[PDB]
């Protein structure tokens, strides 16, 4: 199948997953800035547009650590394969927001092909899943205005382990440009130190070449 | 009456309504800062006062947006024609603080006269709910510190649909005054664009004359 | 016994108290950022390292206020007369964390004495608790990465009323070198006022002499 069945017994965070999931079930959010003033300069030198570009970068993170990709399936602890991102879609015309998803790949040229073939299908379709698999991270997008923190406040979210990352409106802060980006996980699958780990290694990313 | 019944099956978030409601219930916040350099400067050419003022200028944009007044009544979806304000006081004697309401009033002066009103009668009144109708919105005030987030987490939000709005001390970053101001909000009836547009919409009202 | 009962029938906030605690449960988290140029100037005239130093002046400002340091035992409202610090403590080699636990000390050299013993004693110790006493406050880390902004999301905080602390990357902004802070409380025993009364005395702890 598409993903494997996770070894708990010999696992160093097993009294620390058991923890989180039911003595004390919890999740965090957390909201950093990254700096996107390097992106913007290879996007500028680029057909590629910022959202698709965000969204692949995300899930490119995302899929190099287990344990953002991590699922409950039959009882017991997987990991994933590889992830897809679904994220959400504005509709200008009924001020209403649409949720897609489209298959990963490693070929940023592959993933944008995918992308504008999604968003080609349904960029009218206004049901809020257009689409009707589990193996998904969940990217959204404020783009209207900037925000310091972001934070779902969930009525229930037991074993619900797949990341939620919230981006906001850049700005110019100096000399650099800033985006606001927000992190929420259960803390069964992650702990801190996990989340500064994919916070950096997005900021890496965003400051490499893009092909 | 001062509400009206709500169209929900017309309504373009109807599945997002009952999704958010009832399938995944859920609210969010978030914290931007708002740059007040132009209202300090109103403020300053008038008698009125900081507090009293945003009390105001809150409640305007809140009575702007249908999203931000609804309500379940009678098992249904209504709008409030209008809302009031909701604003905690605090008690210097007793460091406690109460919360109070007074009557919006789109002509500032005529507002100004019931804050005073209610301020006057009730400044000594130590009980947390000194007054004893449900079109509410609720303000609350932080002038002791800075914050970049706040949120509150809440036990049990059902239904529970009046933004609540939470300002706090506001500071001198390079050339602005930059004031933080949380919102949080239930997911069934505001969407992240329902947010910004409020936020947005209050920033243009603090760039803008008082009378 | 090291706690006294406290007298809820005669305190200003026992309407606040019943109301936050069962009427309408909940609780808040904040981010601020705390100015550590002075501290940090003083680190470096000393041998003292800056995580055992902000975990003294965390809990120094907390046994300074009785509101941070309550709890229930036996069904009844209580005051711990001192509470000891609950940090956590991460293992590079397996990448996960432990919390332990020292006695907090007026004197910062005895309390650096605990430290590096209880250190000494676990500093290999791979168990989530690995001494197996109630009068605590929680102190955790994130040096890998700056945020804005932190906030738990528990599932059932009924009765909880230790504050949560949470320090992030310091950075230089400006000339000032900033640490962002977390705090969440439950609103049972604490107001925005007490939070803001903590973070102020912390800030004033941190422009100070060690000794
Ligand atoms: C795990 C879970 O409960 O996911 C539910 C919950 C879900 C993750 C949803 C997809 C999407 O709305 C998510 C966003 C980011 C949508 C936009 C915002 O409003 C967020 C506040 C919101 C939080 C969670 C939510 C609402 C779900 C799905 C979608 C499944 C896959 C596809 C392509 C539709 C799900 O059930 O699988
Ligand atoms: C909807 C609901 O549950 O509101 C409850 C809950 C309520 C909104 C309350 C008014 C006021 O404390 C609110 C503030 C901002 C008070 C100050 C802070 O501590 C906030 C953390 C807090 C959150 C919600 C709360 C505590 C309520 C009222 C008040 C009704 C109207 C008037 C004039 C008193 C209510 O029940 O109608
Ligand atoms: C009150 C309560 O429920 O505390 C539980 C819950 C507890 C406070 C825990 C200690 C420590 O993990 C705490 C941290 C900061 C640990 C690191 C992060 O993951 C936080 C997200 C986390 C939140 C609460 C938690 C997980 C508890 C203890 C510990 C008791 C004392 C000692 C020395 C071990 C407890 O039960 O007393
Ligand atoms: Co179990
Ligand atoms: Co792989
Ligand atoms: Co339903
Ligand atoms: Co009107
Ligand atoms: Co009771
Ligand atoms: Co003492």
Same mark, same amino acid.
């Given at each position: 199948?598409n993903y494997?069945?996770?070894?708990?017994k010999?696992?160093?965070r097993?009294? =620390?997953?058991?923890?989180?999931?039911?003595?004390?079930?919890? /999740?965090?959010?957390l909201?950093?800035?990254?700096?996107i003033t390097?992106?913007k300069k290879?996007?500028?030198?680029?057909?590629?547009?910022?959202y698709?570009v965000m969204?692949?970068?995300? $899930?490119? $993170?995302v899929?190099?650590?287990?344990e953002?990709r991590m699922?409950?399936?039959?009882?017991?602890?997987?990991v !994933?394969?590889? *992830?897809?991102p679904?994220? +959400?879609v504005?509709?200008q015309? +009924?001020? +209403?927001?649409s949720?897609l998803?489209?298959?990963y790949?490693?070929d940023?040229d592959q993933? @944008?092909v995918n992308?504008l073939?999604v @968003?080609?299908?349904?960029?009218?379709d206004t049901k809020?899943?257009?689409? /009707?698999?589990?193996?998904?991270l969940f990217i959204?997008?404020?783009? !209207?205005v900037?925000?310091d923190?972001?934070?779902?406040?969930?009525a229930?979210?037991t074993?619900?382990? $797949?990341? *939620?990352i919230?981006?906001?409106?850049?700005?110019?802060?100096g000399?650099?440009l800033?985006?606001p980006?927000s992190?929420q996980? =259960?803390?069964?699958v992650?702990? /801190?130190?996990?989340?500064?780990?994919?916070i950096?290694?997005?900021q890496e990313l965003c400051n490499?070449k893009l092909?």
């Amino acid at each position: 199948m598409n993903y494997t069945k996770f070894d708990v017994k010999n696992w160093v965070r097993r009294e =620390h997953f058991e923890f989180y999931r039911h003595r004390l079930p919890c /999740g965090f959010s957390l909201t950093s800035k990254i700096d996107i003033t390097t992106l913007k300069k290879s996007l500028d030198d680029s057909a590629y547009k910022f959202y698709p570009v965000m969204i692949y970068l995300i $899930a490119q $993170a995302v899929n190099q650590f287990d344990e953002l990709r991590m699922a409950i399936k039959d009882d017991e602890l997987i990991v !994933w394969d590889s *992830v897809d991102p679904c994220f +959400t879609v504005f509709h200008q015309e +009924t001020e +209403t927001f649409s949720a897609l998803s489209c298959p990963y790949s490693s070929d940023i040229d592959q993933f @944008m092909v995918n992308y504008l073939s999604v @968003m080609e299908r349904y960029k009218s379709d206004t049901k809020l899943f257009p689409q /009707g698999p589990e193996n998904h991270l969940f990217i959204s997008a404020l783009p !209207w205005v900037n925000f310091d923190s972001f934070n779902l406040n969930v009525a229930n979210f037991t074993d619900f382990f $797949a990341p *939620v990352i919230t981006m906001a409106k850049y700005q110019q802060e100096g000399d650099r440009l800033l985006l606001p980006l927000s992190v929420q996980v =259960h803390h069964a699958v992650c702990d /801190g130190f996990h989340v500064a780990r994919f916070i950096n290694r997005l900021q890496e990313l965003c400051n490499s070449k893009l092909k």
